[PDB]
C-alpha cells in the first residue's frame, strides 16, 4: 500500500514511537504553581508526506518521579492521566504558559504544525484528512498523550486535537470569533452552550462548577562635572489588575443580561501585573554613549550614590563581575568596542531598573504614609513586582495595600474589564445513560474584539 495518506500515517506512527509515548502513564497530582515554578522542555522533528512540510513539536513539564519500583500497576478502571488532569483546579490561570497549557490545563502535549511558515491549512477537507490520520495514528500505536493539529492560520491560533484511552475518547475543539449574539456575553449563555453540547439524555444534572476571573487595565497615572542621570518619560506603561473567584457553584449567584453579582471588590484574591514602557529614554545610558577610559568609571560611583538609599543589592555583584571581566581585557592592545557595548548595556539596565523602582514607589506612595508598619508593608509590596509579573495583594481590595489600588482606579466602581475568563467543569455519563461517567471541561475568554471557547468533551467509544 503505502499511498500518500498511508505514508503520512506511517510517518506519524514513527514520530510517536521514537519518543516512547506509547503505553500507560501514572504519576503524582500536580501541586499549586507547578506550572509557574517549574520548567518546560521541548523536542522537535520534521515530517512531509507528499509536498506539505509539517513540524512535530512535543512539549512536556519536568517531573521528578522518585519511585520507580512500581511495575506500572494497572487497575480494571483506569481513566487516562490527561482525562483526570482536565479537572485540576490548583493551577488555574498560570501567569506564563503555552496557550494549550493555559486553556486545557495539560502537562504533556504533542503538536503537528506547518513546518516553518507561509503555510496554512484552509479547506475543510485537508483539516479533516489530517484529523483522520491523527485518529488512526492514536488508535494504532496506543499513545494516550493528546495530539493537536494547527488549522486556519498561525495568527488565529486554532487547533483541533484528540486524546484516546481504553473505551474513552476526548475531543479538544476550539472556536474563535469576533462578534456573537448578545446572549453569549454572560455566564448563563455560556452554561446553556455547555449543557447543550453535553447533550446527555439524563436531563437531571449536577450543577457545573465555575471559575471566574476579570482583567482591568489602567494607563493614566493622574499626577562641576556632574553626570546627568534620570528617565524623561515614565518607564512603566500600564497596570493590570486581575480579580479571581477560585471556586463557585451554579445557582449560588446570578449573571445575566439584567442582574450580575461579579463585583471586583468581593473577589477573595487580588493579583497585580505591571507593564514596562518601551524605550524609556534615560539620561545616563546615552550621555557617555555619545563618546563611544575616564567615562567608564563615572557611572560605577554615580549609580552607587543613587542606590545607596535604594539598596537594590544586584549592581554590587554585577559591578564585581564587570571588574573581573575587565581585569584582563582593560589593557589588550587596541581595545575593542565589545566591552564598551557590554558596560553600556549593564549601565542602562541598572539605571532603568532604579528609575522603574522610583516610579513604582512614587505611584503607590510607600513614603506617603504615617503608619511605619503599613508604609513598610507598602515598600515590601513595591519592588517585588519588578522581578516577577504577578504579586498578591494583602486582604484583596479590603486591605490598605489594596485600598490604594482601589483609589487610583476610582480616581481614573471599576472600569469595564477588558477581559473576562470563565472555566466550567462537569462529570456526566455521555452520550448514553448506560455509558461511563466522563469529565467535560470548557474554557472561555471574552474581550472587546475576541471571543474564544476551548472545550474538552469526552465520550464513550465502547457503549455509545
Amino acid at each position: 500500500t503505502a499511498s500518500e495518506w498511508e505514508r503520512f500515517i506511517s510517518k506519524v506512527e514513527e514520530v510517536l514511537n521514537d519518543w516512547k509515548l506509547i503505553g500507560n502513564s501514572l504519576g503524582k497530582p500536580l501541586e499549586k504553581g507547578i506550572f509557574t515554578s517549574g520548567t518546560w522542555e521541548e523536542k522537535s522533528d520534521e515530517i512531509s508526506f507528499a509536498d506539505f512540510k509539517f513540524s512535530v513539536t512535543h512539549h512536556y513539564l519536568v517531573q521528578e518521579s522518585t519511585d520507580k519500583e512500581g511495575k506500572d500497576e494497572l487497575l480494571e478502571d483506569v481513566v487516562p492521566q490527561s482525562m483526570q488532569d482536565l479537572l485540576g483546579m490548583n493551577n488555574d490561570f498560570p501567569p506564563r504558559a503555552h496557550c494549550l497549557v493555559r486553556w486545557y490545563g495539560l502537562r504533556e502535549f504533542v503538536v503537528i504544525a506547518p513546518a516553518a511558515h507561509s503555510d496554512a491549512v484552509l479547506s475543510e477537507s485537508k483539516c479533516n484528512l489530517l484529523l483522520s490520520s491523527v485518529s488512526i495514528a492514536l488508535g494504532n500505536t496506543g499513545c494516550q498523550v493528546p495530539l493537536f493539529v494547527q488549522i486556519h492560520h498561525k495568527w488565529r491560533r486554532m487547533y483541533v486535537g484528540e486524546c484516546q484511552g481504553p473505551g474513552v475518547r476526548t475531543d479538544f475543539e476550539m472556536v474563535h470569533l469576533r462578534k456573537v449574539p448578545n446572549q453569549y456575553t454572560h455566564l448563563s449563555g455560556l452554561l446553556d452552550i455547555f449543557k447543550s453540547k453535553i447533550g446527555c439524555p439524563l436531563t437531571p444534572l449536577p450543577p457545573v462548577s465555575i471559575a471566574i476571573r476579570f482583567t482591568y487595565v489602567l494607563q493614566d497615572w493622574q499626577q562641576f562635572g556632574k553626570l546627568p542621570f534620570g528617565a524623561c518619560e515614565d518607564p512603566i506603561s500600564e497596570l493590570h489588575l486581575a480579580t479571581t473567584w477560585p471556586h463557585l457553584t451554579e445557582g449560588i449567584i446570578v449573571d445575566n443580561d439584567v442582574y450580575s453579582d461579579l463585583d471586583p471588590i468581593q473577589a477573595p484574591h487580588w493579583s497585580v501585573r505591571v507593564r514596562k514602557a518601551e524605550n524609556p529614554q534615560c539620561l545616563l545610558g546615552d550621555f557617555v554613549t555619545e563618546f563611544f577610559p575616564c567615562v567608564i568609571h563615572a557611572a560605577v560611583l554615580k549609580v552607587k550614590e543613587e542606590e545607596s538609599l535604594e539598596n537594590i543589592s544586584s549592581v554590587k555583584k554585577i559591578i564585581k563581575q564587570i571588574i573581573s571581566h575587565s581585569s584582563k581585557v582593560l589593557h589588550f592592545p587596541n581595545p575593542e568596542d565589545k566591552k564598551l557595548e557590554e558596560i553600556i548595556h549593564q549601565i542602562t539596565n541598572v539605571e532603568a531598573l532604579i528609575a522603574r523602582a522610583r516610579s513604582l514607589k512614587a505611584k503607590f506612595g510607600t513614603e506617603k504614609c504615617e503608619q511605619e508598619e503599613e508604609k513598610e508593608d507598602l515598600e515590601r509590596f513595591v519592588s517585588c513586582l519588578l522581578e516577577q509579573p504577578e504579586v498578591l495583594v494583602t486582604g484583596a481590595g479590603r486591605g490598605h495595600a489594596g485600598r490604594i489600588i482601589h483609589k487610583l482606579f476610582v480616581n481614573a466602581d471599576f472600569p469595564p474589564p477588558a477581559g473576562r475568563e470563565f472555566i466550567l467543569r462537569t462529570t456526566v455519563p455521555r452520550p448514553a445513560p448506560y455509558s461511563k461517567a466522563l469529565p467535560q471541561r470548557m474554557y472561555s475568554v471574552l474581550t472587546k474584539e475576541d471571543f474564544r471557547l476551548a472545550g474538552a468533551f469526552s465520550s464513550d467509544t465502547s457503549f455509545f
Partner: protein
C-alpha cells in the same frame, strides 16, 4: 461463544439457475472439475426481513420464491423456499434490472398474528424505470424518474429508540442516480401500494375498471463537484448545537463571518466513488416544496458537496450505516475497509486485506441506562472464504468462521414498513439482521453473537 445456526433449506435452486442461465443447463472419463458458483455473486438478490419471500433476478428475468412448511419424517414443519413465480420483467427492448427490494407491509387491522399484509417488490431498470410488483408477479405500478440507469435503492423503516436520547427519522425510500438523488416519502408509498393492490384485487373479481395512475412524491436533487459516484447512504435529518453551529460557521467563513440566530435543519447524505473518494452532502430541509412518463421533471434543488476526503486514485465501491446511524463502513478498490464517524466526517479504524468484501452489522442488547447495547461489525472476505466479526469501533476480532468462497452476506437494514410507536411495543413478529446464503448447501443461515464477549 459466537455460533452460526442453519435456519432454512432451499427445496430446489438448480431450477432457478437453469431458468436464469439457460446455457448452463456421459463422457469417456474426461477430467471434469473446476466447478464453482459465481451466478449468485452475479445476480440481484433480496430476501424479505420477515422471511416471507425471495427475489432473485439475473438480467431481465426474476424468480420469486415463496416459503412452504413441510412436515418431515419427524413431523417438524421445516422452512423450505419453493419457486413461487418466474418470468421476464422487460417491457421495452434492451431493458435490464439494476436492483431489487422486498418490503413487508404492516397490517392496519391490529392483527396480533405475525402476518404482514404482503411483501411488495420494488425493481429498478437500466432505462430509468421503477416498477412495483406483488408476490404473485402481477404488475402494480411503473414509474420513470430519470432516463439514466437506476443505481441503488435504499428503504428506511421504523425502529424503536435504544434510550431517551435516541431520536426518530422519517420513513423514506431513496433512489440513487449517477449524478442525482431521488427520494420518495414512505407514507406516499404506503397510501399508493395498498390502493393499487385493492384496485387490482377488485378488478380481478368486481371487475373494477382501470384507474388513472396517481403520481408519487418526487424530489430530485442535482449532485455536483463529483466525478464518479457508486453508492450512497441517507443519514437523514439532523440538528446542530450552538457550539457546533459556531464551529462550522467559523471554519466555513473566517474572522468576519456572521452567525445566524436560527440554526437551519440540514439533511445529510454520503456518497462514495471517485474524485473525490467520499463526499458529504448537506441539503436545506423545508427550503423547496416536494414535487408531486417524463424524465425531464425539474430538479427540486441543486446539491453541491460541502466537503469530503479527496483521493483521486482511490475508488470507493460501497457504504453501509450502523444500526445506531452513528458509524459508516466504506470499502475501496485497494482491498481495504474504513470506518467513519458520520457526525465528524473523520475515519476511526481502517482494516486491511479485504478485496471485494461485504459488510454487515449485528446489534446485541444486554438482557436485564436501559441496557448496555453493543454493535459488532461483520467482514466477509470471499476470496479467502472467511467471515469475521469485529467490534463497533475498536476491540479484538470477536469471531472468525470458515464458510464457502461462494456464499453471500445479506444485510437488509430495514424492518416492517408502516408500523408506528404504539403498534411496535404492543406486539411484533420475528425479524433478522443478517443472513448468509450458500450455494453448495443451498441453505440460508444466521449468525448469533452473545453480548457478554464485548466486556472482554
Amino acid at each position: 461463544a459466537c455460533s452460526i445456526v442453519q435456519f432454512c433449506y432451499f427445496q430446489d435452486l438448480q431450477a432457478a439457475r437453469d431458468f436464469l442461465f439457460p446455457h448452463l443447463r456421459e463422457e469417456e472419463g474426461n477430467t471434469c472439475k473446476t466447478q464453482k458458483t459465481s451466478w449468485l455473486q452475479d445476480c440481484v438478490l433480496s430476501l424479505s426481513p420477515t422471511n416471507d419471500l425471495m427475489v432473485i433476478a439475473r438480467e431481465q428475468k426474476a424468480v420469486f420464491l415463496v416459503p412452504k412448511w413441510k412436515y418431515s419424517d419427524k413431523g417438524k414443519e421445516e422452512m423450505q423456499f419453493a419457486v413461487g413465480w418466474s418470468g421476464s420483467l422487460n417491457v421495452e427492448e434492451g431493458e435490464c434490472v439494476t436492483s431489487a427490494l422486498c418490503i413487508p407491509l404492516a397490517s392496519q387491522k391490529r392483527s396480533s398474528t405475525g402476518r404482514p399484509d404482503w411483501t411488495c417488490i420494488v425493481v429498478g431498470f437500466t432505462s430509468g424505470y421503477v416498477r412495483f410488483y406483488t408476490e404473485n408477479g402481477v404488475l402494480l405500478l411503473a414509474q420513470l424518474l430519470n432516463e439514466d440507469p437506476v443505481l441503488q435503492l435504499k428503504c428506511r423503516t421504523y425502529e424503536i429508540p435504544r434510550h431517551p436520547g435516541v431520536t426518530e427519522q422519517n420513513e423514506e425510500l431513496s433512489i440513487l442516480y449517477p449524478a442525482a438523488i431521488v427520494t420518495i416519502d414512505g407514507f406516499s408509498l404506503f397510501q399508493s401500494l395498498r390502493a393499487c393492490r385493492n384496485q387490482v384485487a377488485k378488478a380481478a373479481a368486481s371487475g373494477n375498471e382501470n384507474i388513472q395512475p396517481p403520481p408519487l412524491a418526487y424530489k430530485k436533487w442535482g449532485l455536483q463537484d463529483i466525478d464518479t459516484i457508486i453508492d450512497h447512504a441517507s443519514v437523514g435529518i439532523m440538528t446542530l448545537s450552538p457550539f457546533d453551529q459556531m464551529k462550522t460557521a467559523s471554519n466555513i467563513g473566517g474572522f468576519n463571518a456572521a452567525i445566524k440566530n436560527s440554526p437551519p435543519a440540514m439533511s445529510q447524505y454520503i456518497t462514495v466513488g471517485s474524485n473525490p473518494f467520499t463526499g458529504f452532502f448537506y441539503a436545506l430541509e423545508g427550503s423547496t416544496q416536494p414535487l408531486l412518463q417524463k424524465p425531464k421533471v425539474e430538479p427540486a434543488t441543486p446539491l453541491a458537496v460541502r466537503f469530503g476526503l479527496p483521493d483521486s486514485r482511490r475508488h470507493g465501491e460501497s457504504i453501509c450505516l450502523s444500526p445506531c446511524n452513528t458509524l459508516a463502513a466504506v470499502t475501496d478498490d485497494f482491498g481495504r475497509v474504513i470506518l467513519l464517524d458520520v457526525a465528524r466526517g473523520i475515519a476511526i479504524r481502517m482494516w486491511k486485506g479485504y478485496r471485494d468484501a461485504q459488510i454487515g452489522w449485528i446489534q446485541t442488547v444486554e438482557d436485564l441506562g436501559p441496557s448496555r447495547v453493543a454493535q459488532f461489525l461483520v467482514i466477509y472476505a470471499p476470496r479467502r472464504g472467511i467471515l469475521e466479526v469485529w467490534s463497533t469501533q475498536q476491540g479484538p476480532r470477536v469471531g472468525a468462521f470458515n464458510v464457502g468462497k461462494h456464499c453471500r452476506l445479506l444485510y437488509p437494514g430495514y424492518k416492517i414498513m408502516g408500523l408506528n410507536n404504539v403498534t411496535s411495543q404492543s406486539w411484533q413478529p420475528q425479524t433478522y439482521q443478517i443472513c448468509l446464503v450458500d450455494p453448495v448447501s443451498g441453505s440460508v443461515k444466521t449468525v448469533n453473537v452473545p453480548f457478554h464477549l464485548a466486556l472482554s
